[PDB]
Amino acid sequence: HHMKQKIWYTYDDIHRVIKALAEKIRNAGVKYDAMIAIGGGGFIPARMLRCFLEIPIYAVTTAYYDSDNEGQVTEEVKKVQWLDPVPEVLRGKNVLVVDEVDDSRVTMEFCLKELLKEDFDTVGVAVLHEKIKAKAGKIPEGIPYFSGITVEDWWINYPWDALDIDEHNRLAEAGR
Amino acid sequence: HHMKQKIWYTYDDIHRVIKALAEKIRNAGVKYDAMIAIGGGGFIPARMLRCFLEIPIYAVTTAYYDSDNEGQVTEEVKKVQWLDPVPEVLRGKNVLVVDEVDDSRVTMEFCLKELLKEDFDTVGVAVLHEKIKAKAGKIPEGIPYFSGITVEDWWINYPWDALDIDEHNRLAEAGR
Numbered sequence A, B: 001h002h003m004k005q006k007i008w009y010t011y012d013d014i015h016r017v018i019k020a021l022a023e024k025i026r027n028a029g030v031k032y033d034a035m036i037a038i039g040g041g042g043f044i045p046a047r048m049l050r051c052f053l054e055i056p057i058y059a060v061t062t063a064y065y066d067s068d069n070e071g072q073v074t075e076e077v078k079k080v081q082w083l084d085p086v087p088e089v090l091r092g093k094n095v096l097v098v099d100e101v102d103d104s105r106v107t108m109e110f111c112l113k114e115l116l117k118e119d120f121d122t123v124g125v126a127v128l129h130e131k132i133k134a135k136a137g138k139i140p141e142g143i144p145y146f147s148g149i150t151v152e153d154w155w156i157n158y159p160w161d162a163l164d165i166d167e168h169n170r171l172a173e174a175g176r
């Protein structure tokens, strides 16, 4: 249950945004050598982006876990799978971190801080949807940032969460 | 350029097959604890499958490389990213390997042989499309196998390779 407005996007809607996102990246003048998709949400955006950028997709995954510190239980982000070690072919290369939604930036900050420990040239970040809202996380300095589209602070319903894709598509069209 | 018949599938076409594939898996009676997606082709099928199976997606990636052995250059499959080491939470668990197409089975055999070196309970494999054709690779004994649909030996055009998704969808409908 959510209390804000809601929006549904078709697979094709998202594919079209990814094509435009690839063009934004290409126009910034840094040629990326590989993507690092943050699963699970970044996997589909990253493989769609590969259609247009034609660079390999490496993968990490994060998740929130119940953390009990100082007499208070809150959710914190942790690694589920990581690039340990980073392969030698990526040393000194440009890598593009890919995720589906910029909501709180807590995962994004965690992953970017960890990847800046490595021997990359340029680390950039590309997200499908950028929500306009307050952010708990911060993007480190010097990291190029791209979003496919900016969105209101609405709950986004992704087609890859649709038990009934026909009903999902109906709600997507009923929102246009 | 290909010399066989060709088919185009929409994103929604594939989503519907994945829903049916999840039902085939559920009916076989083994509860899988995690997926291992083989990138890049397995990423989108695996995240679609997560909608219905609700288990985490781990990732490996393979690619073909030019291999020069005994005075003859052929393409061979190699690791690009692997699960090194397998996390302890997966020890003794059931893992479902996910890929998009069963064509030659050379990648599938390579990955399954490598994953059988680990301490899993059940290793199963799920593929979106199973092509009916001769196979160079072999599936090890005792590995449950599921395919979403079986297909003729045709070239499959995936929507995540469509530079123009509208033209892609036109060709998909023109094939029904």
Ligand SMILES: Nc1nc2c(ncn2[C@@H]2O[C@H](COP(=O)(O)OP(=O)(O)O)[C@@H](OP(=O)(O)OP(=O)(O)O)[C@H]2O)c(=O)[nH]1
Binding pocket: A038, A039, A040, A041, A042, A062, A063, A064, A099, A101, A102, A103, A104, A105, A106, A107, A108, A109, A137, A154, A155, A156, A157, A158
């Ligand atoms: N459907 C949907 N999900 C939203 C929306 N806003 C945030 N989320 C989910 O919230 C989770 C936490 O995201 P954040 O930590 O805020 O991500 P950020 O750094 O990229 O801004 C993400 O899942 P996660 O914990 O990273 O899991 P996974 O699904 O990526 O594996 C993301 O998918 C929204 O509008 N719609």
Ligand SMILES: Nc1nc2c(ncn2[C@@H]2O[C@H](COP(=O)(O)OP(=O)(O)O)[C@@H](OP(=O)(O)OP(=O)(O)O)[C@H]2O)c(=O)[nH]1
Binding pocket: B038, B039, B040, B041, B042, B062, B063, B064, B099, B101, B102, B103, B104, B105, B106, B107, B108, B109, B137, B154, B155, B156, B157, B158
């Ligand atoms: N579009 C399309 N591709 C096909 C088709 N048949 C085979 N392929 C591609 O051939 C490559 C080699 O596949 P195999 O090694 O035969 O796969 P298998 O073991 O699962 O049968 C795969 O890409 P890869 O080298 O594994 O790369 P990636 O794209 O998965 O990263 C796969 O996507 C088809 O009908 N259509």
Ligand SMILES: [Mg+2]
Binding pocket: A038, A039, A040, A041, A042, A062, A107
């Ligand atoms: Mg995520």
Ligand SMILES: [Mg+2]
Binding pocket: A082, A083, A084, A085, A086
């Ligand atoms: Mg490390």
Ligand SMILES: [Mg+2]
Binding pocket: B038, B039, B040, B041, B042, B062, B107
């Ligand atoms: Mg593959």
Ligand SMILES: [Mg+2]
Binding pocket: B082, B083, B084, B085, B086
């Ligand atoms: Mg190993």
